[PDB]
Amino acid sequence: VIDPSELTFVQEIGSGQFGLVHLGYWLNKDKVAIKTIREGAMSEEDFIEEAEVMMKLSHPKLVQLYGVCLEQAPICLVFEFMEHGCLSDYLRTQRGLFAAETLLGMCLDVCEGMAYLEEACVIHRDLAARNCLVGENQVIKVSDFGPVKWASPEVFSFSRYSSKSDVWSFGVLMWEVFSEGKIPYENRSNSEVVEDISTGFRLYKPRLASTHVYQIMNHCWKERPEDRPAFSRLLRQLAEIAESG
Q1: How this protein is processed and modified after translation, per its record?
Q2: How many Cα atoms sit within 13 Å of 78 on the Cβ side?
């Protein structure tokens, strides 16, 4: 479902060399988030690809995408518009006012999301506070799919992702969720961070984090893949804890 220039570029909200995020309007009817590319950033085909599979997957937790502008000029990707930035930022401000049944009432949102792609046998190579999004009321959807801090042991040394490679990045994020948006492994050098975790150093327990929460966080940070859960199981797991304390 390719789109033409029926979009009204209003503002920008996110930089980096691979797409400037541009809030605009299509048909004026819907609010959207338009991510443009550049000029040398990615092949036509190259980018055609990823776009093709993002239209394949669809879940009330994954940022729904709208149309595309292969119609020459700034070839961009137009997704719906999440009314509340990225979990990251959203977690920064608003800080405090967050209760626990809710911080947990997001994690699953991410999770639900990730079990799908987990099964969609799709490896989101960057699951983080900074990639997920907040929208139509506490509802949390994931995007930018298709940073050693969030990586796992088999990504530093090998770069051997495996869906379970994420399960960890899902952890670090989780951490964030709870530590209301704090950078994990700060007073630490990437070229240090590793060691710390290499020995066996996990992120301290963020206050809001519960005793049974920290149980998972580590299930996410188990050193060996094989013994790290599966998003599929996690969902059942977080479903449990979301039921009590």
Answers
A1: Ubiquitinated.
A2: 25
- The residue type found at 14 is G
Which positions ≥6 away from 234 have C-beta within 8 Å? 111, 115, 167, 170, 216
146 assigned ligand-binding residue: no
Work out the burial of residue 117: count CB atoms within 10 Å of its CB; fewer than 13 is exposed, 13-18 middle, 19 or more buried.
buried
- Smallest CA-to-CA distance from 165 within 125, 194, 197 is with 125
Residue 13 known to bind ligand: yes
Resolution in A: 3.2
The catalytic residues are: 126
Label residue 115 left, alpha or beta by phi (over 0 means left) and psi (-120 to 50 means alpha).
alpha
21 is in an annotated binding site: yes
- Is residue 132 within 8 A of residue 174, CB to CB? The reply is no
Choosing among 3.30.460.10, 1.10.10.10, 3.40.50.1100, 3.30.200.20, the CATH entry for 1-83 is 3.30.200.20
